[PDB]
């Protein structure tokens, strides 16, 4: 697979520059001033065959050709068959994503379907990562969704959501991975989030709410366009490092993790939370 | 895990603890310990049901056994309606030697309660429901033998009640399958539930030894009273024998719940047995009886001696006809004398229930061996087996 | 222990473990 | 069997600020480790073109400086360590007799009736249980269809734990680097029991439960020498797939470590 | 030496947001365990009365239940370890030449050209230093007055660490239960370089780093063993009073673990 | 405006049975009927507006309707602002507090009084916190002063007290909010040891219990300065937790919990405090 | 060493109660009425002899007398030699301990001196705890301390100071065992109380700021007598732990950790400090 990565082609008199994130390049040769030119008016991936045609018709030799995309920075080619085939956003306001699946093809995410929480029969296929985001979180909803899903065969889940001044995105639930569920997330953050001074969640005040049926909404800020935005690249970046056309590599240790940002400070924390001991996703 | 401990002046007891396990598909346990106080409450199955079910199992018998305080003295008949009173008295004169004069004169210990089927308020001897020997022990020569049958706890009244009325069933159907030897079916031993914990607990049972599963329901009551039965007759296993009972609409369900009963029971006492726990530590009669129990005889007894009403053993776990028909109403046509002694306190912004139900039409309580109202609307003398008539079941 | 001084009311079992 | 003790009885004396704070830690050093990751992660924060003068060295106490008490290598009276196995090849049949032989060597006293071990533990608690992965068709079985067993070293016997098969297992130990592993015919996997590390000697047992896992698979790779298997330990895999698929659950146990065995050809 | 490496060269890799939260977790497990300290601290949260129920026990996958294949002890082909030496008694002058066949034994190949150890190392990156330190006047000594060395495994020879008498050392390592260990002749100290341990594989490099102690002492059992002397490892010191002692900085280093040697006889 | 408490109706046919927290009624006019089952539906709060709306529907008087609601535990009336306008402290030990009126200003805590236990005449004002604290604990003590003041507009009482090496400060108790008292914790936890199913022959209720027998104060055991200072920290900050506290804005988990104090290790314990169905505070 | 731990001895009628932490006995014998009379007049640690004499002026035979007092928790017996002879406290309010020498004795603790920070020419002897308690905190006045006295043989110092709404109490620094010092924990705690979601201090703001001579002082919360007075009862406990009658061992993971107190919800943490990586300490 070939994916197009980020960069600029300029040009003044007779003057060229391709900038990337990788390097910079004076171009003082036409026909690729026009494969870079057409390069940047497509959206991520491009099939080899389209792009050897790129080269032919710039009469430019194929290998050298590509050896300079590649080593300058405006392609790369990846080999690696990828674990989730395909990424579903169900969401409260799926009007926040009414472009995302267009536009996030140029980050090489694939995103098939937005989905509004309100549909009944909802269908995901196998092998598919589901992402649910809500502004007006309810227990319920996560529950709904796993009560559904869970048992798709190679499915994965990610939840996001606000809590107080925070934007949460859970670490990846993946039952065949058996990694921690937002059940196990959403602990651990209301448990650092109480004045005990404590670790430990656990005393009689908390064993007799364990008692009422399993249910609650979350305090937060109320949300403006400009903490909407935020959220979005925030989605986006996350998609594109889990699915789509990795610019950065994360180190394993981390990879599947939660990220948390500050809505205030715009600080991003990256923690790998534990299993809950209440929790029953380990035993499902 | 979790393990909440309380100092020994707080309200709360002294320890709680959800046990590790190695196996994600074994259920989980949790337990309570409080000194003396009341013997260890634990629950098993799903972690926060296990959890909860610690938690109401630890209310429920600290409220019967350590908590009860009675409303007042009254004879039977200032106490509720005439023929509630006279059921009651007639339950008495099998219990004790005294006369039916003597009954009717005494003033008993009285707590609340209701008639399940009118709602009529009324009150009830206290000395059925309070399992200590202080809160009404000027009535004990009426009714020596006590015991938590038809006892529950929870966040609602419908949900106690609910629970009362499943554990009455419980107990009310075992009585009968020990005393008669009958029950409705067979399901087979090798049933496959597809319920992972439930699956993991069978076949471990099967592979240590043999199981029973019977389905014991009072004859023509709705839902399914599930009797498990274990034995081994391996050398090296400590429990060579152990059962689970539980009731409930869904057969599935009823089936599901009585294996963790099982797992429940059977894991408790091997816990005691290769702690090396000596018999001072055992306080409770029936904890007393049922370890005695603990032989490869009492599953051949019990199954040589049962009598099937269908001879096909079930391969699935469908329900029928009968299973959702009323139970008010099937419980209601053997006796209207049924009663639901009640108590309430405010936790936070909520109230948790205390429960009991308790008919002198039934079954009082479960120890056939003790003094008990033998002659009731389910069972006369010499209906049934005659040693079982004398001997406690043996069950926990 | 039963003493020649006095009756003995009540034990905190705990803390005498540790007085382990 | 006759020397079981029952988790209950260790979780009456956790303290449950200690368990959370212990594993919270424990997971940061977890991995995802998996063939579909590899162009999108990296283990080594050191460029594979520098690693090389990190490798086999020794710190100094005082740097630039060369005033040692040589000492004679003619006191060895050892065998050379076998180079660590890679390319594992399991074309030959292995018999569960020379896995047995592993096991009781290893992890075992010779004496049947003895309670020692062949590594010392502290407070005498080993913490650390030793499961046992079968990777290939080629390797004997004792039971039909059962790939996963924990090994009872006061017992010496192998309990059943899974029936998963021999390409999920090996799919889930091997993590990104299968290609470079090959084909190993069985591995172990040591897991810490949080809380029989932990109750006794609270934070410091956790560092207690690490070095005696290293003291048990230290004799597993001398045992191994000794019987002519090659061995590799192995951390690159995914700690939350390889636990979820021997059914261990991750709130009590986690695997430290596994350990790669067989035969090194072609 | 011809081996050596800078740290300046490692810590050019490192996080310091890692190196920091290792640290943290660490010192949680750090003891000040004293003779002085003994009517006002403990080290066991289980009483001793209730300790025997504990020891050398199984925790079962499937507790309660009996059905396991069991593995014949006539495949076993090695000797007992020794029971760990308590009561250590000094009497007995100890000759250089047994320390030096330990040290080589254990933790060097036979090869003096050869970087390999009888021990593996993730990414041979070997984080673990071994400190000899001398605590009788019983034992003979290569230098006069120096009472700590540092063991250089691929230079097979001893550097100068520190000066600070017999007693102190002795004091430093034996915490609050010093009568009953007795006098050893010398003790091994096992310590973590903190930065050598993370700056490859971060959080999980401790790990790795704490199992490698674990086989590097394991592999001293074994030697001891078979040298005739007798050993004890040991976790009841304080770990800062014997960094201190030794002159090591905290900073990068710590004591993971002591290992005593000796006699045991009166 | 109005709190909502906790209750049951359970209906049987045409039967229908009310049961709260004080009361058991039987339910025989349809209206009524109508008005439980909206209320507990409610889930704690509603407005006087939405009460006198769902009365004149279900054609009950408003006044017969509101007043059997209150008498029978399905309402309370409580206001939005401060339950309590100040604090009243009746000690044994009096002299402890003589500068924590004037002290206690700035932490926005207001003490009115401090008040000796052995004075003969105590009066206290409507809407007052009454705040008792004893060194010499004995069980008459808190009975007398509930029988002085439980009927006083707004009153409500905490009690602070020593227990072998603990500090124990109870929940508020509140006739008009229903919360638990003293005795729903000490007499229940003594019933507890009595009922034992194998007593303790050690029990420290031999010792409570003697204490009565023998007409003996409970000795806070060999306090000194130091103890006293700690004290008297934690009854400030409790008070100020207390202070402009209201149903409005502070959960009813604020009065029914209580702290416990081991003055040797200074760590505090905070437990709920629930009612006990047996105790004579439920007698009304 | 005999230690007469917290008891009271109370009479009425013909009846008499013993009552300590351990136990209650219901006293029968006159002679040893008379004996826990006496030790309860007297301040922590009492002669073997005087406690001998006190037995035998009872005709109590010794032995069993011992017996009882030991085993009903009035006294015990302690063997070992502490590693610090003396305490002293070095204070900008020495006033606020003007009575501790002479109190904190019934509680095991031997405080030599109460020591003016204001003095010139401050003189310690060997082996001795050095407690500094500053509520007008400023660095230079730790530097100067540590100057003067670090190099005393067996020479340790605690530090307690105010920071925020805190009560900080350092770790034991002593030199000799090798741990961190007031620096390695001030530096924890302002590092921990800025707002970067980071556990790592170091960026180059701060690499900026430690080229100024390195001073400063600490924001805090105004005190006032109940603060002071918790604060008082802290510092009793925490040298009553170190070198006073032990009530409640410590685990030895802990013992010589920090102890910070939140003033206003009075809850502790006990927690152990890295050395700082820019602190000198560990060289000196
Ligand atoms: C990490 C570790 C720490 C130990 N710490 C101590 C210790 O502090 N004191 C002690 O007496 N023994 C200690 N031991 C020795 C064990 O108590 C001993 O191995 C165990 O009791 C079994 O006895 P054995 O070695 O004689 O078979 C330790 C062992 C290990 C592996
Ligand atoms: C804790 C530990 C983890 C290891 N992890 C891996 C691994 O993930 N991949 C690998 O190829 N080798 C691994 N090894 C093997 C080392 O790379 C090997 O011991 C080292 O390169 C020296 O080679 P040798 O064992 O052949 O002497 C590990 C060794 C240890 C002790
Ligand atoms: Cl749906
Ligand atoms: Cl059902
Ligand atoms: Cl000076
Ligand atoms: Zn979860
Ligand atoms: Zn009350
Ligand atoms: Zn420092």
Same mark, same amino acid.
Not at chain 2, 236 to 240: A, E, H, Q, V
């Given at each position: 697979m070939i994916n197009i990565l980020p960069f600029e082609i300029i040009s003044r008199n007779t003057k060229t520059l391709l900038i990337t994130y990788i390097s910079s390049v004076d171009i003082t040769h036409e026909g690729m001033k026009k494969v870079l030119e057409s390069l940047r008016s497509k959206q991520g991936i491009i099939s080899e065959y389209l792009l050897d045609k790129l080269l032919d018709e710039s009469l430019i030799d194929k290998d050298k050709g590509k050896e300079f995309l590649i080593t300058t920075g405006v392609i790369n080619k990846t080999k690696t068959s990828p674990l989730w085939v395909n990424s579903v956003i169900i969401s409260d306001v799926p009007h926040l994503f009414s472009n995302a699946r267009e536009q996030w093809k140029c980050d090489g995410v694939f995103v098939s379907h937005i989905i509004d929480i309100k549909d009944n029969n909802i269908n995901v296929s196998d092998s598919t990562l589901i992402w649910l985001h809500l502004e007006n979180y309810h227990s319920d909803i996560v529950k709904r969704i796993y009560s559904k899903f869970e048992s798709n065969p190679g499915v994965a889940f990610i939840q996001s959501y606000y809590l107080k001044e925070s934007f949460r995105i859970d670490g990846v639930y993946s039952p065949d991975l058996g990694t921690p569920c937002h059940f196990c997330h959403i602990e651990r953050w209301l448990s650092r989030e109480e004045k005990s001074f404590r670790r430990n969640e656990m005393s009689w005040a908390n064993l007799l709410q364990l008692l009422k049926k399993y249910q609650m909404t979350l305090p937060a800020l109320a949300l403006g366009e400009s903490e909407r935005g935020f959220s979005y690249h925030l989605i986006k970046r996350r998609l594109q490092e889990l699915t789509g056309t990795s610019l950065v590599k994360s180190h394993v240790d981390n990879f599947m993790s939660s990220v948390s940002a500050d809505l205030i400070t715009c600080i991003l924390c990256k923690e790998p939370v534990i299993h809950w001991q209440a929790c029953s996703c380990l035993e499902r | 895990m979790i393990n909440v401990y309380s100092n020994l002046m707080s309200a709360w007891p002294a320890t709680m603890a959800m046990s590790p396990k190695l196996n994600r598909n074994m259920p989980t346990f949790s337990q309570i310990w409080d000194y #003396? =106080?009341?013997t260890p409450a634990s629950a098993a199955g799903e972690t926060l049901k296990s959890i909860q079910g610690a938690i109401g199992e630890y209310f429920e018998r600290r409220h019967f056994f350590n908590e009860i305080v009675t409303g007042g003295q009254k004879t039977l008949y200032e106490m509720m309606p005439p023929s509630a009173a006279k059921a009651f008295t007639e339950a008495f004169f099998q219990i004790s030697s005294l006369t039916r004069d003597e009954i009717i004169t005494h003033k008993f210990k009285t707590v609340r309660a209701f008639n399940l089927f009118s709602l009529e308020q009324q009150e009830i001897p206290a000395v059925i429901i309070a399992l200590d020997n202080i809160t009404a022990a000027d009535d004990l020569k009426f009714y020596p033998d006590r015991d938590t049958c038809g006892c529950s706890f929870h966040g609602s009244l419908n949900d106690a009640i609910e629970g009362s009325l499943c554990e009455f069933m419980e107990r009310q159907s075992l009585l009968l399958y020990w005393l008669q030897g009958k029950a409705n079916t067979e399901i087979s @031993? #090798?049933?496959?539930?597809?319920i992972n914990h439930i699956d993991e607990i069978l076949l471990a049972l099967r592979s240590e030894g043999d199981i029973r599963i019977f389905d014991?329901?009072?004859?023509?009551?709705?839902?399914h009273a599930v009797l498990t039965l274990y034995g081994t007759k391996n050398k090296? @296993? =400590?429990?060579?024998y152990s059962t689970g009972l539980s009731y409930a609409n869904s057969l599935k369900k009823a089936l599901c719940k009585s294996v963790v009963e099982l797992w429940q029971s059977y894991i408790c006492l091997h816990n005691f047995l290769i702690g090396g726990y000596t018999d001072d530590d055992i306080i409770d009669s029936y904890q007393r009886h049922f370890m005695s129990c603990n032989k490869y005889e009492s599953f051949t007894d019990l199954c040589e001696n049962t009598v099937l009403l269908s001879d096909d053993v079930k391969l699935t776990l469908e329900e029928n006809i009968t299973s959702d028909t009323n139970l008010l109403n099937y419980l209601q046509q053997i006796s209207d004398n049924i009663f639901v002694y009640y108590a309430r306190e405010r936790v936070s912004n909520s109230l948790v229930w205390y429960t009991k139900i308790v008919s002198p039409d039934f079954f009082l309580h479960m120890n056939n061996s003790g003094a008990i109202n033998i002659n009731n609307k389910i069972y006369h003398t010499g209906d049934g087996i005659k040693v079982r008539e004398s001997k406690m079941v043996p069950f926990p | 222990k039963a003493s020649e001084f006095g009756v003995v009311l009540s034990v905190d079992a705990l803390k005498l473990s540790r007085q382990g | 069997s006759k020397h079981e003790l029952s988790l209950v009885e260790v979780t009456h004396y956790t303290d449950p600020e200690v368990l959370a704070i212990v594993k919270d830690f424990h997971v940061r050093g977890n991995f995802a480790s998996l063939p579909e990751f590899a162009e999108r992660t990296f283990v080594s924060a050191v460029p594979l073109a520098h690693l090389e003068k990190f490798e086999n060295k020794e710190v100094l106490f005082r740097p630039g400086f060369s005033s040692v008490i040589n000492i004679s290598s003619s006191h060895n009276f050892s065998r050379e360590r076998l180079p660590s196995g890679i390319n594992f090849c399991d074309k030959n049949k292995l018999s569960i007799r020379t896995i047995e032989k592993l096991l009781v060597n290893a992890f075992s006293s010779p004496d049947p009736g003895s309670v020692r071990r062949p590594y010392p533990s502290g407070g005498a608690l080993y913490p650390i249980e030793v499961f046992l992965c079968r990777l290939s068709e080629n390797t004997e079985n004792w039971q039909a269809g059962t790939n996963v067993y924990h090994y009872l070293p006061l017992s010496q016997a192998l309990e059943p734990v899974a029936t998963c098969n021999t390409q999920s297992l090996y799919r889930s130990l091997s993590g990104g680097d299968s290609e470079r592993l090959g084909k190993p015919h069985f591995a172990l996997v040591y897991c810490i029991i949080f809380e029989k590390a932990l109750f006794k000697y609270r934070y410091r047992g956790y560092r207690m439960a690490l070095m005696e896992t290293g003291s048990m698979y230290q004799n597993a790779v001398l045992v191994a020498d000794q019987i002519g298997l090659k061995n590799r330990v192995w951390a690159g895999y995914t700690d939350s797939y390889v636990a979820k698929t021997m059914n261990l659950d991750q709130r009590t146990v986690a695997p430290l470590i596994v350990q790669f065995f067989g035969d090194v050809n072609d």
């Open positions: - | #003396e =106080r009341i @031993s #090798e049933i496959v539930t597809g014991i329901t009072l004859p023509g009551a709705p839902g090296i @296993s =400590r429990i060579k | - | -």
